Structures are given as C-alpha cells and as structure tokens.
Design a protein around this ligand. Structure first.
Ligand SMILES: CN1CCC(n2cc(Nc3nc(OC4(C)CC4)c4nc(C(=O)N(C)C)ccc4n3)cn2)CC1
Length: 284
C-alpha cells in the first residue's frame, strides 16, 4: 500500500473540509473511529478516513491494515494507502460511488429504490465476501448494511475490518447490538456470529427497513422472524413496497436463508458456503 505523508492528504481533501459534499465540502459520512472524506489523487476519487487513548487507537488503525493486506477479494473494499503521522492517522480507500447499502435502502439524498434484481445480486456479492473471509480464517465481527458498500456497478463490497479477528472469549464486547448474535453479546468470538448478522442484513434487503427504529413495532427487525413464525404477520406484509419486480418465490427463498441465519443456537445456523449455495439457487 502507498504511504502518504499527512500533508499530501490534507491538500487532496480541501484541508479536511468537514462540510458535506452536497454543500461544497469533503465530508461523505462518519464511522466508528472517524469521519470519511472525499479526496482526489491524480484525477482518481478516493475515500479518506481520519481517525480511547493514542496507544489504543494505533492497534485499531493497524488492524484495518493487517487484515486488508491479507484479504483481497472482489467483494471486499480495497485499501489504497495510509498515513503514519503518529498522532494523526489516515486510511485511504477506493471510493465507492454508490456508498452503503444502508443509505441505498433508505434512498438517502434522493437515490432511486434498488430493484429486487439488484438486491439479489448484492446479497450474493455480500455472501461471497464473507465466504472469502471465513476461508482465510477471519471473523468480521461487524457485518451490517452500513459496512456493505456499492461500487460503480452496485457490486457489494464488505468494509471495515477494524474489529476483524484471526483463527474463543473476550472481556471487551464490540459490534452493532441490533445485528449481534446472542453469543456474540456474551463475549464469544465465532464465524457463526457473522452468519447471524448477515441474516439481519437479508431482512433489511427484503423489507427496506433499518435493523432498529425506536418509533416502530417491533423496534428490532430480527423480531419480525417471530411475528411470521407466529402467523401474526406474513412476509408479503413486510416486503419493501419501493419495488415493482419482486416475486413471491425468490422473496420466500431469501427469507428462508435469513430465517436459517437467525437461529438462536449458533450450531443450528448454516455456514457461509451453504448460505452462498442457497442464495445461488434462489436466482437459478
Ligand atoms: C447521493 N450520492 C452521494 C455520494 C455517495 N457516496 C459515495 C461514497 N463513497 C464511499 N463512502 C464510504 O463510506 C461512507 C458510505 C460513509 C461515507 C466509503 N467507505 C470506505 C471504507 O471502507 N471505510 C471508510 C471504512 C471505502 C470507500 C467508501 N466510499 C459515500 N457516499 C453516494 C450517493
């Protein structure tokens, strides 16, 4: 990866302009651990991350780099470089022109709704990236639709490997609570927890609803699994109304994958290879 001096990056981001790209600045969004800025290096668009002590933020910055060097795939975000300025820490990525799946499902900034067809392809691409990580003995630990980015062709790219671990218990439980498996919430580190998170993501893809909404019933999207199983509601009642091309058969087939992924018992969940196989059969 390219080593940037902090000055190189400050200049390409209009002095790290915290104003949104809609107003004229360079801010595109925010993550865990930093604001993301639009940068331009040699007429190529790049994404820049400017990053709880100084010695603790270093091992979390080194993580994204450690994992991103070992893991390169068509469905993983590509790291282009970094900036080692001691205190100031920056990560540079290939800019995803279509941002996150989260933003594209909510139609943020007026983007049109994703079709069922586009959704199915994104689900498959997201599963392929998780499969590559699991084959390379890595647990993502933060699978969610804000961590699924879309390129120039809406190819799904898993991102954010700051919490990714190699191959177990931990005292420091980290992740996104509305996507987390009961055992991950208990401290277990397992690739099976990632499958569960992916199941929440498949429900987001079918429903177009966020994983958690305080002004909703039920507030957690994974709870709809119980409403359907308890025949209080149907999957037809929950399909995203912002589509014109969804068919009952493939919608039921993706719901069945999500339902299996969301089993409360980690060992009763399918592995990613089975998830990939099942999503492939949905479009065959
Ligand atoms: C209406 N238009 C307006 C433009 C918009 N747009 C394009 C982007 N590009 C984009 N965004 C990223 O992060 C976001 C989603 C939080 C901003 C991002 N993150 C990483 C990454 O891996 N990180 C940091 C860990 C890598 C590449 C990235 N590329 C954002 N918004 C699409 C819709």
């Amino acid at each position: 990866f390219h080593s940037f001096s902090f000055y190189e990056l400050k200049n390409v981001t209009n002095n790290f302009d915290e104003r949104p790209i809609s107003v004229g600045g360079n801010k595109m969004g925010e993550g865990g651990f930093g604001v993301v800025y639009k940068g331009y290096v040699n007429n190529t668009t790049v994404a820049v991350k400017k990053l709880i002590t100084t010695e603790e933020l270093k091992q979390q910055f080194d993580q994204e780099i450690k994992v991103m060097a070992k893991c390169q795939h068509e469905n993983l975000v590509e790291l282009l470089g970094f900036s080692s300025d001691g205190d100031d820490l920056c990560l540079v990525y290939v800019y995803m022109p279509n941002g996150s799946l989260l933003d594209r499902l909510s139609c943020l900034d007026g983007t049109p709704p994703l079709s069922w067809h586009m959704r199915c392809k994104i689900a498959q691409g997201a599963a392929n990236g998780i499969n590559f990580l699991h084959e390379n003995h890595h647990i993502h630990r933060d699978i969610k639709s804000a961590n699924i980015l879309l390129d120039e062709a809406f190819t799904a790219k898993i991102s954010d490997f700051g919490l990714a671990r190699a191959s177990v218990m931990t005292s420091r439980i980290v992740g996104t609570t509305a996507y987390m498996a009961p055992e991950a919430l208990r401290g277990e580190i397992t690739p099976k927890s990632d499958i569960y998170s992916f199941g929440v993501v498949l429900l987001e893809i079918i429903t177009g609803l966020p994983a958690v909404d305080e002004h909703r019933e039920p507030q957690l999207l994974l709870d709809i699994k119980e409403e359907i199983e308890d025949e209080e509601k149907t999957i037809e009642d929950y399909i995203d109304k912002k589509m014109n091309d969804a068919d009952s058969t493939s919608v039921e087939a993706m719901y069945s994958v999500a339902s299996q992924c969301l089993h409360e018992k980690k060992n009763k969940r399918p592995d990613i290879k089975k998830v990939q196989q099942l999503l492939q059969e949905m479009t065959a």
